[PDB]
Amino acid sequence: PKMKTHKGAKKRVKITASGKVVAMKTGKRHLNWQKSGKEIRQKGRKFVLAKPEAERIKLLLPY
Amino acid sequence: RVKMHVKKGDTVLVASGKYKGRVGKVKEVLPKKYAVIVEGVNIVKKAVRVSPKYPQGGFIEKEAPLHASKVRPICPACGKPTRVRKKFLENGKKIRVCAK
Amino acid sequence: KKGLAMAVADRAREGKLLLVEAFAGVNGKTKEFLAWAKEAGLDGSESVLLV
RNA sequence: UAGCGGGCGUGGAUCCCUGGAUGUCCGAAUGGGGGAACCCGGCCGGCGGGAACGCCGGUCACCGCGCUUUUUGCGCGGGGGGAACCUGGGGAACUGAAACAUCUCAGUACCCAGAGGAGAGGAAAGAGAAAUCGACUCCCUGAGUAGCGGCGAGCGAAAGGGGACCAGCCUAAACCGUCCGGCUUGUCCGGGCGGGGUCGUGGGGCCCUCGGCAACCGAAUCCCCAGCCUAGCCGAAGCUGUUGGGAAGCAGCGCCAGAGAGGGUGAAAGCCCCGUAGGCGAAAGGUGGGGGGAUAGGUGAGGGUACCCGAGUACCCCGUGGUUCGUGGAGCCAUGGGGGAAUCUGGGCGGACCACCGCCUAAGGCUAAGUACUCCGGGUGACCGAUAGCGCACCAGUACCGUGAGGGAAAGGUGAAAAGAACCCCGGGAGGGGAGUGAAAUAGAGCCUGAAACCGUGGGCUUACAAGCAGUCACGGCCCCGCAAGGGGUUGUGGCGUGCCUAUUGAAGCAUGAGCCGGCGACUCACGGUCGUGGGCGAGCUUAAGCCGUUGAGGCGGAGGCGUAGGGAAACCGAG
Ligand SMILES: [Mg+2]
Ligand SMILES: [Mg+2]
Ligand SMILES: [Mg+2]
Ligand SMILES: [Mg+2]
Ligand SMILES: [Mg+2]
Ligand SMILES: [Mg+2]
Ligand SMILES: [Mg+2]
Ligand SMILES: [Mg+2]
Ligand SMILES: [Mg+2]
Ligand SMILES: [Mg+2]
Ligand SMILES: [Mg+2]
Ligand SMILES: [Mg+2]
Ligand SMILES: [Mg+2]
Ligand SMILES: [Mg+2]
Ligand SMILES: [Mg+2]
Ligand SMILES: [Mg+2]
Ligand SMILES: [Mg+2]
Ligand SMILES: [Mg+2]
Ligand SMILES: [Mg+2]
Ligand SMILES: [Mg+2]
Ligand SMILES: [Mg+2]
Ligand SMILES: [Mg+2]
Ligand SMILES: [Mg+2]
Ligand SMILES: [Mg+2]
Ligand SMILES: [Mg+2]
Ligand SMILES: [Mg+2]
Ligand SMILES: [Mg+2]
Ligand SMILES: [Mg+2]
Ligand SMILES: [Mg+2]
Ligand SMILES: [Mg+2]
Ligand SMILES: [Mg+2]
Ligand SMILES: [Mg+2]
Ligand SMILES: [Mg+2]
Ligand SMILES: [Mg+2]
Ligand SMILES: [Mg+2]
Ligand SMILES: [Mg+2]
Ligand SMILES: [Mg+2]
Ligand SMILES: [Mg+2]
Ligand SMILES: [Mg+2]
Ligand SMILES: [Mg+2]
Ligand SMILES: [Mg+2]
Ligand SMILES: [Mg+2]
Ligand SMILES: [Mg+2]
Ligand SMILES: [Mg+2]
Ligand SMILES: [Mg+2]
Ligand SMILES: [Mg+2]
Ligand SMILES: [Mg+2]
Ligand SMILES: [Mg+2]
Ligand SMILES: [Mg+2]
Ligand SMILES: [Mg+2]
Ligand SMILES: [Mg+2]
Ligand SMILES: [Mg+2]
Ligand SMILES: [Mg+2]
Ligand SMILES: [Mg+2]
Ligand SMILES: [Mg+2]
Ligand SMILES: [Mg+2]
Ligand SMILES: [Mg+2]
Ligand SMILES: [Mg+2]
Ligand SMILES: [Mg+2]
Ligand SMILES: [Mg+2]
Ligand SMILES: [Mg+2]
Ligand SMILES: [Mg+2]
Ligand SMILES: [Mg+2]
Ligand SMILES: [Mg+2]
Ligand SMILES: [Mg+2]
Ligand SMILES: [Mg+2]
Ligand SMILES: [Mg+2]
Ligand SMILES: [Mg+2]
Ligand SMILES: [Mg+2]
Ligand SMILES: [Mg+2]
Ligand SMILES: [Mg+2]
Ligand SMILES: [Mg+2]
Ligand SMILES: [Mg+2]
Ligand SMILES: [Mg+2]
Ligand SMILES: [Mg+2]
Ligand SMILES: [Mg+2]
Ligand SMILES: [Mg+2]
Ligand SMILES: [Mg+2]
Ligand SMILES: [Mg+2]
Ligand SMILES: [Mg+2]
Ligand SMILES: [Mg+2]
Ligand SMILES: [Mg+2]
Ligand SMILES: [Mg+2]
Ligand SMILES: [Mg+2]
Ligand SMILES: [Mg+2]
Ligand SMILES: [Mg+2]
Ligand SMILES: [Mg+2]
Ligand SMILES: [Mg+2]
Ligand SMILES: [Mg+2]
Ligand SMILES: [Mg+2]
Ligand SMILES: [Mg+2]
Ligand SMILES: [Mg+2]
Ligand SMILES: [Mg+2]
Ligand SMILES: [Mg+2]
Ligand SMILES: [Mg+2]
Ligand SMILES: [Mg+2]
Ligand SMILES: [Mg+2]
Ligand SMILES: [Mg+2]
Ligand SMILES: [Mg+2]
Ligand SMILES: [Mg+2]
Ligand SMILES: [Mg+2]
Ligand SMILES: [Mg+2]
Ligand SMILES: [Mg+2]
Ligand SMILES: [Mg+2]
Ligand SMILES: [Mg+2]
Ligand SMILES: [Mg+2]
Ligand SMILES: [Mg+2]
Ligand SMILES: [Mg+2]
Ligand SMILES: [Mg+2]
Ligand SMILES: [Mg+2]
Ligand SMILES: [Mg+2]
Ligand SMILES: [Mg+2]
Ligand SMILES: [Mg+2]
Ligand SMILES: [Mg+2]
Ligand SMILES: [Mg+2]
Ligand SMILES: [Mg+2]
Ligand SMILES: [Mg+2]
Ligand SMILES: [Mg+2]
Ligand SMILES: [Mg+2]
Ligand SMILES: [Mg+2]
Ligand SMILES: [Mg+2]
Ligand SMILES: [Mg+2]
Ligand SMILES: [Mg+2]
Ligand SMILES: [Mg+2]
Ligand SMILES: [Mg+2]
Ligand SMILES: [Mg+2]
Ligand SMILES: [Mg+2]
Ligand SMILES: [Mg+2]
Ligand SMILES: [Mg+2]
Ligand SMILES: [Mg+2]
Ligand SMILES: [Mg+2]
Ligand SMILES: [Mg+2]
Ligand SMILES: [Mg+2]
Ligand SMILES: [Mg+2]
Ligand SMILES: [Mg+2]
Ligand SMILES: [Mg+2]
Ligand SMILES: [Mg+2]
Ligand SMILES: [Mg+2]
Ligand SMILES: [Mg+2]
Ligand SMILES: [Mg+2]
Ligand SMILES: [Mg+2]
Ligand SMILES: [Mg+2]
Ligand SMILES: [Mg+2]
Ligand SMILES: [Mg+2]
Ligand SMILES: [Mg+2]
Ligand SMILES: [Mg+2]
Ligand SMILES: [Mg+2]
Ligand SMILES: [Mg+2]
Ligand SMILES: [Mg+2]
Ligand SMILES: [Mg+2]
Ligand SMILES: [Mg+2]
Ligand SMILES: [Mg+2]
Ligand SMILES: [Mg+2]
Ligand SMILES: [Mg+2]
Ligand SMILES: [Mg+2]
């Protein structure tokens, strides 16, 4: 009883005001070596999901 | 306790079933079963004798008890409910307006 | 609230509501209130919520 | 609980309440033994002729505490049990992580010791950011927040705010007197007793100066009482006719109601009975601060000096436990090992450490209420109604099963009333047939109702040249219903035709399950989500625990929650 927020999610995702869900781009802490400077500049911008946005949101709700 | 009820060995009207209207003295009060025998509800017990002793016992059609509810006490009138009332000491039941 | 008001209202728009004060049938005794009832037109023909 | 056979009661029995008496033997079991309910004794006294024997009454277990001269004694107490609740000492695994070891399940299950109508906790060496709060416990909220986490599974606080309850106390030490023991006579060494003392505006001790107190407070201890509990009592109002086996139904007139809750009476009763509303009651036991009374206790201001303020403790380190905290920057609380102080210029704490600013006074104990539970009594159910409801409506923790721990059933109903069927008849009996009772006997005694499977008797249609998932369609014959057109039962020939469920690409299938009937039998609820939908209100909407009502009446209660601003990891900025 009383759903608990998924801490794992909250620690890496945000609900936007319109109900979207965003997170940092993957693949930018390792594979790094000299990947085009362009790549890593674009691995900085965060993005929105799609369907797991809904899977994701459910894991919150008090949030 | 509590087993007490309407009245005792005395005069009474049967407002019951088949013996409605009939009236007479109650010869026995059974407090446990809550019954009384008067002179009504006579019933023939075809049976021989009632005990392992003596020969002929007769079809003694003697009275069968009645639910104490169907009999009502009575005094200078006709079927008056009971009402207890105490004097300067003890206690005696005056009928609906009279006494005893 | 609304319900309470609306109920009292419904029974007013209906005409059945009646305010009083002239309770001469005081003194807790059914027969008295029974007498006051007739005078007030509560012939006991209809159920009543006496508040 | 009837019967045989005898008794008692208005000189007030039975029965109910309180207290008392008697209470074999076993059981903590306690003189000793023992295979519980048996066996055997010591001492004092009694009974029989009573020395031998036996019976009767009393007494004799063990441990702890205190007096008792070590000795023997004397007194007070402990031992065992209890459904659940409680505390402490120990403490799993399946399981979850879709494997598994950290982790989870969980300090759960269980074992053990103890406490009591409760138990625990409890008057800050606290909280933690307000220069704020002010014992403890309980509820709501804060909050699924802060955090914790093979940052996986998952786990998950506190401050604060709203409520219930409300309460505060006693000592150790410095100091003085006394008693006993000790030496090397000292306001001295130890022990016991009394006085003194008890807190963080730090307090107390000892000295100087003021009352040299009437007073003011006052119990959690006693005493009286009210009230209440353990039996009870009073209690309004109805008759007639009618149908019937039986009124309480139907009808006619009438009444009570602080009582029209419910139950019973041959059916369906406010006024017949038991009650209900409303009132009354204790000699005796239990309870009893709610009221009253008493006692125990309890308290003022400055100055001086530095006597005291709980030790193998604080403190540090090694090993761990607790907390939201899993070694993490890891404090705090607790402590198994090693080292080891100070008495306010003293110590602990505010999350490593240092400084600053503040909080609190460890190393002794006690404390009501609000809280938990339900063996027991009572009240009430949009709770069951005999395969249900407790395992048990009934002679059940029984029968029966098992060496044992343990397992554990089935089984309720005649009728209003036994009026339980005299008597006759067939029969060894059982059981029937009459007679009889009853409204009813196909209510006849494991007897209301009496379904289905299953067995049988009688009647109608049908069958011995016939090939079948048993039926359906058509026509014909026979039998039966209605004046009739018609309908019912049956089946001769003809046409047609691969059971039901399950599982499968596919089943009549030689794939699954079912002997048949009856009854039991499987998508629920709680909390939190997310949509949809019916309404209330709207930049607002809504209360939680609780309090006041009520006894199937609701109101109060804004603490708190969602919404009115987003973006950023954040500092921060803001329709950006
Ligand atoms: Mg990364
Ligand atoms: Mg290249
Ligand atoms: Mg009367
Ligand atoms: Mg007897
Ligand atoms: Mg006699
Ligand atoms: Mg007695
Ligand atoms: Mg006894
Ligand atoms: Mg004994
Ligand atoms: Mg013994
Ligand atoms: Mg023994
Ligand atoms: Mg002799
Ligand atoms: Mg002898
Ligand atoms: Mg002795
Ligand atoms: Mg012993
Ligand atoms: Mg011992
Ligand atoms: Mg000992
Ligand atoms: Mg001695
Ligand atoms: Mg003594
Ligand atoms: Mg004593
Ligand atoms: Mg005990
Ligand atoms: Mg253990
Ligand atoms: Mg495991
Ligand atoms: Mg395992
Ligand atoms: Mg697993
Ligand atoms: Mg699961
Ligand atoms: Mg698995
Ligand atoms: Mg395995
Ligand atoms: Mg691991
Ligand atoms: Mg745990
Ligand atoms: Mg714990
Ligand atoms: Mg434990
Ligand atoms: Mg205890
Ligand atoms: Mg209590
Ligand atoms: Mg307590
Ligand atoms: Mg304590
Ligand atoms: Mg204080
Ligand atoms: Mg802090
Ligand atoms: Mg202040
Ligand atoms: Mg605070
Ligand atoms: Mg406060
Ligand atoms: Mg809460
Ligand atoms: Mg990690
Ligand atoms: Mg845990
Ligand atoms: Mg609080
Ligand atoms: Mg406030
Ligand atoms: Mg509070
Ligand atoms: Mg001491
Ligand atoms: Mg001293
Ligand atoms: Mg002295
Ligand atoms: Mg001394
Ligand atoms: Mg002495
Ligand atoms: Mg001496
Ligand atoms: Mg001395
Ligand atoms: Mg002393
Ligand atoms: Mg004192
Ligand atoms: Mg003192
Ligand atoms: Mg002081
Ligand atoms: Mg001086
Ligand atoms: Mg003076
Ligand atoms: Mg003075
Ligand atoms: Mg004086
Ligand atoms: Mg009083
Ligand atoms: Mg009282
Ligand atoms: Mg009583
Ligand atoms: Mg009466
Ligand atoms: Mg009456
Ligand atoms: Mg007639
Ligand atoms: Mg009739
Ligand atoms: Mg008649
Ligand atoms: Mg009648
Ligand atoms: Mg008249
Ligand atoms: Mg009255
Ligand atoms: Mg009726
Ligand atoms: Mg009635
Ligand atoms: Mg009384
Ligand atoms: Mg008395
Ligand atoms: Mg008394
Ligand atoms: Mg008692
Ligand atoms: Mg008492
Ligand atoms: Mg009290
Ligand atoms: Mg005195
Ligand atoms: Mg004073
Ligand atoms: Mg001074
Ligand atoms: Mg000075
Ligand atoms: Mg001086
Ligand atoms: Mg000075
Ligand atoms: Mg000074
Ligand atoms: Mg000390
Ligand atoms: Mg120690
Ligand atoms: Mg780890
Ligand atoms: Mg842990
Ligand atoms: Mg800390
Ligand atoms: Mg240690
Ligand atoms: Mg000092
Ligand atoms: Mg110095
Ligand atoms: Mg510390
Ligand atoms: Mg601290
Ligand atoms: Mg510290
Ligand atoms: Mg602190
Ligand atoms: Mg700090
Ligand atoms: Mg501070
Ligand atoms: Mg503090
Ligand atoms: Mg203290
Ligand atoms: Mg001490
Ligand atoms: Mg203390
Ligand atoms: Mg000590
Ligand atoms: Mg206590
Ligand atoms: Mg409960
Ligand atoms: Mg229960
Ligand atoms: Mg009970
Ligand atoms: Mg009960
Ligand atoms: Mg039912
Ligand atoms: Mg049955
Ligand atoms: Mg049945
Ligand atoms: Mg059973
Ligand atoms: Mg039984
Ligand atoms: Mg069996
Ligand atoms: Mg069974
Ligand atoms: Mg019988
Ligand atoms: Mg016969
Ligand atoms: Mg023979
Ligand atoms: Mg016979
Ligand atoms: Mg016959
Ligand atoms: Mg007849
Ligand atoms: Mg009939
Ligand atoms: Mg007949
Ligand atoms: Mg029949
Ligand atoms: Mg019948
Ligand atoms: Mg039979
Ligand atoms: Mg039968
Ligand atoms: Mg019946
Ligand atoms: Mg049949
Ligand atoms: Mg046949
Ligand atoms: Mg033929
Ligand atoms: Mg054939
Ligand atoms: Mg063929
Ligand atoms: Mg025929
Ligand atoms: Mg016809
Ligand atoms: Mg055919
Ligand atoms: Mg064919
Ligand atoms: Mg085919
Ligand atoms: Mg099926
Ligand atoms: Mg076959
Ligand atoms: Mg097969
Ligand atoms: Mg298979
Ligand atoms: Mg098959
Ligand atoms: Mg199957
Ligand atoms: Mg079979
Ligand atoms: Mg469902
Ligand atoms: Mg929903
Ligand atoms: Mg709406
Ligand atoms: Mg609201
Ligand atoms: Mg307000
Ligand atoms: Mg306020
Ligand atoms: Mg952001």
Swiss-Prot record, chain A:
| Organism domain of life | Bacteria
Alphabetized GO MF terms:
structural constituent of ribosome
Q: Which UniProt keywords apply?
A: Ribonucleoprotein, Ribosomal protein
Pfam families xref list: Ribosomal_L35p
Q: Which residues form a coiled coil?
A: none
Q: Which GO terms describe its biological process?
A: translation
The record's annotation in PROSITE patterns points to: RIBOSOMAL_L35
| GO CC annotations, alphabetized | cytosolic large ribosomal subunit
- What Gene3D superfamilies does the record point to? 4.10.410.60
**Family of this protein:** Belongs to the bacterial ribosomal protein bL35 family.
Name it. Answer: Large ribosomal subunit protein bL35
Q: Which organism is it from?
A: Thermus thermophilus (strain ATCC BAA-163 / DSM 7039 / HB27)
State the gene name recorded for this protein.
rpmI
Curated annotation (Swiss-Prot), chain B:
Q: Which GO terms describe its cellular component?
A: ribonucleoprotein complex; ribosome
Question: SUPFAM superfamilies from the entry?
Answer: Translation proteins SH3-like domain
The GO terms this record gives for MF are:
rRNA binding; structural constituent of ribosome
**Entry keyword RNA-binding:** yes
Which Pfam family, any one of them, does this sequence belong to? ribosomal_L24
UniProt keywords (A-Z) are: Ribonucleoprotein, Ribosomal protein, RNA-binding, rRNA-binding
Q: Give the UniProt record's GO annotations in the biological process aspect.
A: translation
Q: Which CDD domains match?
A: KOW_RPL26
Keyword Ribonucleoprotein carried by entry? yes
Q: Which SMART domains match?
A: KOW
Family label:
Belongs to the universal ribosomal protein uL24 family.
Q: What does the subunit comment say?
A: Part of the 50S ribosomal subunit.
HAMAP family, per this entry? Ribosomal_uL24_B
State its role: One of two assembly initiator proteins, it binds directly to the 5'-end of the 23S rRNA, where it nucleates assembly of the 50S subunit.
Protein name, entry field: Large ribosomal subunit protein uL24
**Species of the source:** Thermus thermophilus (strain ATCC BAA-163 / DSM 7039 / HB27)
Swiss-Prot record, chain C:
Protein name as annotated: Large ribosomal subunit protein uL4
Top-level taxon of origin: Bacteria
Q: How does it assemble?
A: Part of the 50S ribosomal subunit.
Membrane-spanning segments = none
What family does this belong to? Belongs to the universal ribosomal protein uL4 family.
Shown stretch of the complete protein? 102 to 152 of 205
Q: What does this protein do?
A: One of the primary rRNA binding proteins, this protein initially binds near the 5'-end of the 23S rRNA. It is important during the early stages of 50S assembly. It makes multiple contacts with different domains of the 23S rRNA in the assembled 50S subunit and ribosome. Forms part of the polypeptide exit tunnel.
